[PDB]
Amino acid sequence: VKLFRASEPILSVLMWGVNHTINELSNVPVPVMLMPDDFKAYSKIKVDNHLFNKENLPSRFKFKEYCPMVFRNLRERFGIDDQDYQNSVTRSAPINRFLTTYDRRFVIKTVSSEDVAEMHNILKKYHQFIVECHGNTLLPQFLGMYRLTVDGVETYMVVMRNVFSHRLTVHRKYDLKVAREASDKEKAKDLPTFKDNDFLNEGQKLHVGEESKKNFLEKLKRDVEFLAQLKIMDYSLLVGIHDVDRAEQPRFFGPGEFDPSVDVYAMKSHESSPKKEVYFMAIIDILTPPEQYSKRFNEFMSNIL
């Protein structure tokens, strides 16, 4: 029995709605191809119960899913099974607006109306790019877009795949994009989002060796050249470090052990490295709309190995 019991009611609706839309979709055949109307399409349901099923859901709420055929195909192209997607959203309420599924596999971010407009303006070219690189990309991986209405207030959310491991703790984090640095305020939280400058003054490097590095650089170049060819900028590269040794301090998951089909942004450290670490790296914040930025970004990221 799925009760959709959640930390907040909007989360109960998110769970009900992803459950509902994924079931609905399972009755819609998979097309030979997507058509242009699939990029202008939407699913909308309005719920007015009365003295019924009110234990965990509101009696009245609205759920809208944008481009359901497109995002279903994207999910497939990212290797994500539709029932797995549904289970991570509905088996248990998401947690900590910014959320993750109970199982830490997927991320749910509240977004603006404008960001939705921007996702639409870029969706056809983004889908075409996803297919051209066979799902192997450092860009955000959008798995669904939804509009929730509960108490006459609309809330937009985008579900995408996590950059970090769903099982390996990320010990330090950096956000790379002038000069930007972390506040005495930011620096005082548990795991701070340190910006570029503080990572430079710290002097950490990531040794992945030539073989890994070459193909990684290939993929980063492809992504930023695409984002430039769409005149998008102010995007960042998010990078997280996991120290196996620190993690140390009946089937047992091993130390620094992970599944690359699941933690798709992860890389093991090279043999010639100071500490044994695992790294997660991917591009973020790509919905706020120059080409020159592509150049500075790629050169910046280039000098770490």
Ligand X SMILES: Nc1nc(N)c2ncn([C@@H]3O[C@H](COP(=O)(O)OP(=O)(O)OP(=O)(O)O)[C@@H](O)[C@H]3O)c2n1
285 is in an annotated binding site: yes
Give the list of residues 6+ apart from residue 216 with CB closer than 8 angstroms, or none: 208, 267, 281
Q: Which residues of 263-283 are buried (b: 16+ CB within 10 A; e: fewer)?
A: bbbbbbbbeeeeeebbbbbbb
Binding mask 198-237 for ligand CX0 (x = CB under 6 A): ----------------------------------------
Q: Which residue is nearest to ligand X (CB)?
A: 120
| Stretch touching ligand CX0 by CB under 6 A, among 24-32, 51-59, 85-93, 158-166 | 158-166
- Cβ–Cβ under 8 Å, residues 216 and 137: no
Question: How many chain residues interact with ligand CX0 (CB under 6 A)?
Answer: 10
Q: Is 257 in the site for a copy of itself (CB under 8 A)?
A: no
- Cβ–Cβ under 8 Å, residues 272 and 207: yes
In the complex, minimum distance from the CB of residue 129 to ligand X, in angstroms, rounded to a whole number = 18
Helix axes 68-77, 113-132, angle to 10 degrees: 40
3-class state of residue 277 by DSSP:
strand
96 is in an annotated binding site: no
Pairing of strands 60-66, 142-149: antiparallel
Strands of 71-153, DSSP E? 98-100, 106-111, 142-149
Give the list of residues 6+ apart from residue 144 with CB closer than 8 angstroms, or none: 18, 21, 65, 71, 75, 85, 158, 159
| Stretch touching a copy of itself by CB under 8 A, among 50-58, 131-139, 275-283, 289-297 | 50-58
215 is in an annotated binding site: no
Q: Is 163 in the site for ligand CX0 (CB under 6 A)?
A: yes
Site for ligand X in 37-66 (CB under 6 A): 40
What residue 53 binds from ligand CX0, ligand X, a copy of itself, none (CB within 5 to 8 A, per partner kind)?
a copy of itself
Q: Which residues of 62-88 are buried (b: 16+ CB within 10 A; e: fewer)?
A: bbbbbbbbbbbbbbeebebebeebbbb
167 is in an annotated binding site: no
The count of C-alpha atoms lying within 13 angstroms of the C-alpha of 251, restricted to the half-sphere facing its C-beta, is 1
What residue 117 binds from a copy of itself, ligand X, ligand CX0, none (CB within 5 to 8 A, per partner kind)?
ligand X
What residue 23 binds from ligand X, a copy of itself, ligand CX0, none (CB within 5 to 8 A, per partner kind)?
a copy of itself
Q: Is 113 in the site for ligand X (CB under 6 A)?
A: yes
Q: Is 11 in the site for a copy of itself (CB under 8 A)?
A: no
Q: Which of 77, 104, 109, 120 binds ligand X (CB under 6 A)?
A: 120
Give the Cα separation of 44 and 64 in Å (integer): 4
Q: Which of 83, 121, 183, 215 binds ligand X (CB under 6 A)?
A: 121
Give the Cα separation of 167 and 258 in Å (integer): 8
Interface positions with ligand X (CB under 6 A): 40, 113, 116-117, 120-121
Interface positions with ligand CX0 (CB under 6 A): 98, 107, 160, 162-164, 193, 238, 284-285
Catalytic residue IDs? 109, 234
Interface positions with a copy of itself (CB under 8 A): 1-4, 23-24, 26-29, 37-38, 40-53, 68-69
